[PDB]
Symmetry: C2
């Protein structure tokens, strides 16, 4: 019966994507049932047996009983023993034996050797094959289809093959129901490529061909193509919850390995961001790894500045609070800190009174909470605000510089800065001002800015609307993208140069993935796109090999720049230690001037060489050309 | 600073290690032949003076106190430390050869500890297998999983415990898989021609 489920559902589906779909409501039902029936019979490991059944019924004669009872015995074994999760049919064995007792018979039993040849890489051999085929099937047709414009392409089809038009009529009908083909392709993609971290570098070639598809209809396909194509590059979510679990409990149950500290510096100088998963366990139950993990989160947030004192507290209804004491390295002098891990806001309201019991306001205090409830961020934080205005008693208790609330599952931050400032801060809502001087966020104060949530949270993307007065309506709409890079350091002997090229290229591909998402999404005409890079290592390379490195990069990408139309990039990187703020200057055309400065006292001043825009201060709001 | 290079357990290693050689040296010269001749070998090892000898004689005189207490010391530091450092075990393997009724408790604690300091790490390999299974199992979409199960079924490492914490974890694939890996790894000697998973009315897999 499954054999019929197969031919029926498959012919229907290849007919789906041949164009024969009818534009009516029933489509969304018919194809949906059809598709699940496919997938289900595709997981069901009785397909290959039933098709070699079906051929082996039609070659009942001409038969050597040795090879038939051999293949048929051991399939029977496979059928009884199929309730194991990992059993596949003796493919290679049957091929060898057939080739041994074999060519009249060979030319009567050909269909099986080609069946087994399709069937060598398993039932997920098929899961590869079918979608891969469909992909180039879709691909050739719809890539030739919009290789310029509909008319010219159809006229080139007419004259390249003037003699016949049947391919043309099936073509015209098919891309007539293109949106149906295309939507349903997304559907198929969604429930296979929608969640599969493993993928074999054989498909991705076709996918990178597939991403270039340039039309309004192929815009879902484009965002899924990219989101999937990257997805593999941040896998194993619960796996790294397991790896950090291991590192912490093993390293810490003795906390004297001496290699624990080496792993801890790899934890606090890990290029991969673990602010995703780290919150789920730093409120597990073992007070030491609690403490360690929690302060490691602090240390990894404001990791940029220098800390000269850190004391662990352990207080009444037991709860461990840490206190910090540090100072600024020239941001704009000293301050302390507090981290507290709490389970629910209710409890916070109860155990309040000892938290300021054991506490110019010079304290930073950030509290991590779970928040798998009170789903509305606005009733949520609104309550939080009127908690501050009901009890500023915290402020009466020797004052706090800032109180940030961290609500967990990318955690939504809720920053409340105020002794005389207005309380809740909106420029910084949904983010923790860790690196905040670094993201020079006052240099965009001439703007109305919208926090956009985004994957790969390393990569923070900002939307800029030129803020103008009521008298006139805005002309500029620029994408700013500011990223973060949290690496340890690099040793010399030219290790850095290769690193710069490879990491820059990878990050740049991520950046164009983002601006691509920006095009696909609603898009409006950006002019002066921004790239922000914080290199936190300290290489000893030269400035002029930095200039060749940025030369090789920018030169390497040509048209690509002009399509995404990226106009501004800034880095710093400390070398021998001096700082060098490189700011890139390119207008229409690919001609580019590189601006290198110096930071000099008394309000610090970017000063070149000779560099354009020599003399200005640092909080320069962004020109709205 | 010279004691202080290898840390706070730089000290817990170092001091006891010294004490160990103190015990070791004394009682190794003590037993080689028989008590009298050995004391005569002491006469000639330090022919000129015998004060070291008298302190020696005094020390192994109250051996049983020393001996119990050596066991004690090992017990409340090396009583549990599968973390092993390539500096003690040399002295310890010297220590294992000690061949007398008096030096008879020390041998089983020294060795039994020194052995459980070998490969297993029960909760560590429960963690490694935790990884293998959960990593392998969200879609079993690896294909190299089969290669790792054949490494389990042709595994040098012993795995034979019961693993109660996951063997009733309620996820139908790891249910089925784990149970049959137990079957297969039990009855590995014979030839298998058929295996069916069943599924009672509620939620138990046979």
């Amino acid at each position: 019966k499954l054999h019929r489920v197969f031919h029926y559902v498959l012919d229907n589906l290849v007919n789906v994507m041949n164009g024969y779909c009818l534009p009516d409501p029933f489509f969304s039902s018919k194809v949906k049932d059809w598709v699940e029936r496919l997938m289900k019979t595709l997981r069901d490991p009785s397909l290959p047996l039933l098709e070699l059944q079906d051929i082996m019924t039609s070659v009942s004669g001409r038969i050597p009983p040795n090879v038939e009872k051999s293949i048929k015995k051991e399939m029977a074994q496979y059928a009884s023993n199929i309730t194991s999760v990992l059993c596949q049919f003796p493919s290679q064995q049957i091929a060898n034996i057939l080739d041994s007792h074999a060519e009249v018979f060979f030319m009567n039993t050909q269909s099986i050797v080609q069946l087994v040849q399709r069937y060598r890489s398993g039932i997920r051999g098929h899961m590869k094959a079918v979608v891969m085929d469909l992909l180039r099937q879709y691909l050739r047709v719809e890539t030739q289809f919009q290789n310029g414009h509909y008319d010219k392409c159809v006229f080139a089809l007419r004259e390249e093959n003037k003699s016949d038009m049947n391919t043309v009529l099936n073509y015209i009908f098919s891309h007539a129901q293109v949106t149906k083909k295309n939507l349903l392709v997304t559907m198929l993609i969604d429930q296979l490529c929608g969640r599969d971290p493993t993928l074999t570098d054989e498909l991705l070639n076709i996918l990178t061909e597939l991403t270039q598809l340039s039309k309004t209809t192929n815009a879902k396909v484009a965002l899924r193509a990219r989101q999937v194509l990257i997805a593999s590059h941040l896998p194993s979510y619960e796996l790294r919850h397991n790896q950090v679990e291991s590192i912490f409990l093993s390293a810490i149950d003795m906390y004297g390995h001496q290699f624990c500290i080496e792993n801890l510096q790899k934890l606090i100088l890990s290029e991969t961001s673990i602010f995703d998963v780290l919150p789920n366990f730093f409120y597990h139950s073992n007070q030491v790894v609690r403490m360690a993990a929690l302060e490691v989160y602090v240390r990894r947030a404001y990791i940029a500045y220098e800390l000269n004192s850190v004391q662990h507290r352990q207080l009444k209804d037991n709860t461990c609070v840490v206190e910090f004491q540090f100072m600024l390295p020239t941001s704009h002098c000293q301050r302390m800190g507090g981290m507290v891990s709490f389970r629910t806001f209710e409890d916070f309201v109860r155990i309040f009174d000892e938290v300021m019991g054991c506490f110019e306001p010079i304290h930073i205090l950030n509290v991590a909470i779970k928040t798998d409830c009170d789903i509305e961020d606005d009733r949520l934080a609104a309550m939080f605000r009127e908690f501050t205005q009901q009890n500023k008693a915290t402020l009466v208790d020797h004052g706090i510089r800032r109180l940030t609330f961290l609500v967990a599952q990318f955690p939504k931050f809720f920053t409340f800065r105020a002794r005389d400032k207005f309380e809740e801060d909106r420029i910084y809502r949904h983010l923790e001002p860790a690196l905040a001087f670094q993201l020079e966020l006052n240099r965009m104060r001439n703007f109305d800015l919208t926090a956009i949530p985004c994957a790969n949270h390393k990569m923070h993307l900002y939307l800029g609307a030129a803020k103008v007065e009521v008298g006139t309506e805005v002309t500029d709409y620029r994408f700013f993208v500011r990223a973060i890079i949290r690496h340890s350091d690099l040793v010399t002997k030219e290790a850095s140069f290769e690193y710069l090229q490879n990491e820059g290229e990878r990050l740049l591909l991520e950046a164009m993935d983002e601006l691509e998402v920006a095009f696909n999404n609603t898009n409006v005409r950006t002019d002066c796109n921004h790239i922000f890079l914080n290199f936190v290592p300290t290489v000893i390379m030269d400035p002029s090999k930095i200039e060749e490195s940025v030369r090789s990069m920018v030169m390497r990408y040509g048209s690509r720049l002009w399509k995404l139309r990226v106009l501004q990039a800034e880095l710093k990187i400390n070398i021998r230690a001096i700082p060098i703020r490189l700011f890139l200057t390119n207008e229409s055309g690919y001609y580019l001037d590189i601006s290198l400065y110096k930071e000099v006292t008394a309000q610090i001043m970017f000063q070149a060489k000779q560099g354009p825009l020599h003399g200005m201060l640092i909080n320069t709001p962004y020109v709205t050309k």
